[PDB]
Structure formats: C-alpha cells, structure tokens
C-alpha cells in the first residue's frame, strides 16, 4: 500500500501545474481516484474524483472550476491540473484510490506545490562536526546544516537510510533573506567515530539537487 506521486514543484503566479498519481502495481480493475488538498498546518479538503471507467469527474465547489482531473487507462495514472495559480494554491496535494476492496484503500505521499515569483535555489550543506563540545558519556551528536534553499521541501537521510534512530530533522525556517534553512542532527557512539562513516543525504527536488556530505570529527 504505497501510491506514487510526482515530485514537488515551484510555479510562478498566473501559471498552471499538472501532477500525477499512479499505483505501484498494475492493479487493474475498476477503481476511483480521490484528491485532497492541505495547506501547511491546516486541515484536509476534498478536491474531487476522476473515475477511469467512464471518465466521470466531480469537483468541490470551492475550487471554482480551477481544478481539472483526468486519467490514462493504459498507465493507470490520474492527473490533477490546477490553473491560473495564486498563493492560495501553495499546498500539499494527495491522491487516494478507492472502490476496489476498500474505501480509501491506499494513499499517495502527497505533492508539495509552491506558487512564487522567487526562483529555485539548491541548498548548501555544511557539517555539524562531532567534538568534545557535542559529546556526553559515550555518545556524540553530529549533523548537517541545510542552508539557503527555496522552495520547500528538502529531504534528509543518514547513511542512505541505514541510520534512523536518534535522527532529528528540524522544521525549516524562513530567513530574512527569503530562503529556508534547517539542521538535521543525530546521536551516535563516541567510539564509532574512528571506524564508522556518517553521511547526510540531502535531496532538494525543486532544484534537482542532491548532495551527500561526509561529516568528519
């Protein structure tokens, strides 16, 4: 149960955007795709549905006809296109597949759309090196500062996902420069520093940037 959705995008005001949603399996059979919108920090709102079987569609009146839902039977993919974009459109969009067996059976991860006149910018990744000033007991703290990027979001993993316990990735903060910044920290064995490598994998899909930074003591 894991629906796939297209990545995050930055789009200028007045423009449009089209996002996709497809099952991670051939699936087949008659199913319906439900779409949902969520502004940052707010609740969920139903956008509408697209019924591949007959091409039927239905939309929440609140979108004033700005949303268009379509689908491609061959690829089992559903699309959501939003027009004449405004800041009101900056939000995360989700898709869910229903009817088959369920009732909101599977959900996609969501697609974060940011409407802005500002240009995309990849982050600079600096190390937060472990030292006696970040070590207590046999435990050392270390991390990565993901600075000056736009727009959201960025993803941070440690050692290709092999390190998850103790990882704390802070909420991005908008700086006075209009760019975002955040840190991701993790605690590890102080004795491992000489043998084990610790690398933060940073991905900023809006700028198509990916950086892996090894954090040295």
């Amino acid at each position: 149960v894991q629906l796939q959705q297209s990545g995050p995008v930055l789009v200028k005001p007045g423009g449009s955007v089209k996002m996709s949603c497809k099952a991670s399996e051939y699936t087949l059979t008659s199913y319906l795709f439900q779409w949902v919108k969520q502004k940052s920090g707010q609740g969920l709102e139903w956008i509408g549905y697209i019924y591949p079987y007959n091409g039927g569609t239905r939309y929440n009146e609140k979108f004033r006809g700005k949303a268009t839902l379509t689908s491609d039977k061959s690829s089992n993919t559903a699309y959501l296109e939003l027009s004449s974009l405004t800041s009101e459109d900056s939000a995360v969009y989700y898709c869910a597949r229903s009817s088959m067996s369920d009732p909101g059976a599977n959900w996609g991860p969501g697609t974060l759309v940011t409407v802005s006149s500002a240009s995309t910018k990849g982050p600079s990744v600096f190390p937060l090196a472990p030292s006696s000033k970040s070590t207590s007991g046999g435990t050392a703290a270390l991390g990565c500062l993901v600075k000056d990027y736009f727009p959201e979001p960025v993803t941070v993993s440690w050692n290709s996902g092999a390190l998850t316990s103790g990882v704390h990735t802070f909420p991005a903060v908008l700086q006075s420069s209009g760019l975002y910044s955040l840190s991701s920290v993790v605690t590890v064995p102080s004795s491992s520093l000489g043998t084990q490598t610790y690398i933060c994998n940073v991905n900023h899909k809006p700028s198509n940037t990916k950086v892996d930074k090894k954090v040295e003591p």
Partner: protein, 219 residues
Amino acid sequence: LDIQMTQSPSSLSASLGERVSLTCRASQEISGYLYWLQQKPDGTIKRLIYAGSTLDSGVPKRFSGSRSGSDYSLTISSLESEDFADYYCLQYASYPRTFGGGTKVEIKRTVAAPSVFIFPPSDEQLKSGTASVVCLLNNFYPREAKVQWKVDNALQSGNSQESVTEQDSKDSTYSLSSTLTLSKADYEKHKVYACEVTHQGLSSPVTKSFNRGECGAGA
C-alpha cells in the same frame, strides 16, 4: 446539503499507555460510511478504520472504531509514542466528501532533562562568508525551554532563531536548535560563544560554550 463532520476534541493530551477516544458527529445520516485516518508528522496518511468499525488489515488491534447514533468514535486503547499524529474522520456516504476538523494528539511522559551541545560554524561555511553557531537541546520534556546566547559575556539579542521538532516517534521527547547567525567578520571578531539553557529537568541553568581560538576541539 453538504454533510458536516464535527470532530472533537481539536487537541488531546494523554499519558503513554492510556486509552483515548476521538468523536466525530455527522450532521446527516451516513449509514456507517465513516472513515478514520492518521497523518504522521512527515505527512504520511494511512487508513485506520472504514465502514465505521472495520479495521484496516495493516493497522494494529489497538485502534478501534464504533458508532452511537450520529456519533462515531475512534478509540486507541494503549497510546504509544508512535501514535503522535493528527487524526481525521471522513464521511463517504455522499458528495462532496467532507472531513472533520482533525484531532492533534499530545503525549504526556516523564520529565527528561535535555543534553546540551554546541557546534561552531564549519570552515566551509566561513569560506562562504557567513557563520552559523548551533546550540542543540536534545531529547527533553516538557516543551518549555529557555535558551540565551552570550558572546564574550555579552547577552545577545535579535540574531538567533529556534526550531523545535515534534514529539519523537520513539520516546515522545522534543529537541530544539538555537542558531546564532553572524557575518564571518563579526564571528572572527569575538572569541567565546556560550549557550545557556534553562529547563525544568535541570536543577540549575546549564551553559555550553566554546572558544573560537581553540576551534571546536581542544587545540
């Protein structure tokens, strides 16, 4: 028309291991076509219950769903740290599909003093022309915490920003970062950078600092 879903409470606090319940009231008959979902901090949404009381096969027995007239409730028998998230009800008896306002679950746990660490700016950032000094308050509880910056014994003001994580999915604690941002020039002009933190779990305020001259280690 438009079926209204009234969910309560908006925010819920409870000790780990307790049994908690969320209610959703339908303004119209929905014939058990009520759905419960969980949205974790990282955005992940998953089906918990459907048909009012049917449990998703992938969800643990701790989650239960019931109905009493126009009242529908989601019950989590034994709260776990992993349950920290926002919960929403959704009726699918008719269109438009409508959601409840949501419930945010807060987890109460034993007090935990934070471990305090400080990080000098990296040489790499300095080359860029900027300096970020980071103070980390790790794994504490409750949320209440005060962090003050002193540069060469002078209290700092207006040049730092703090960020806090949501309660940890494993132990329900918080972590906080306080970042002091300076121009490379201003960072090079001073030597002692201190982070002073006050927290309930700490007997007295703790001060963590470093001397730019000694670098990050003991040079």
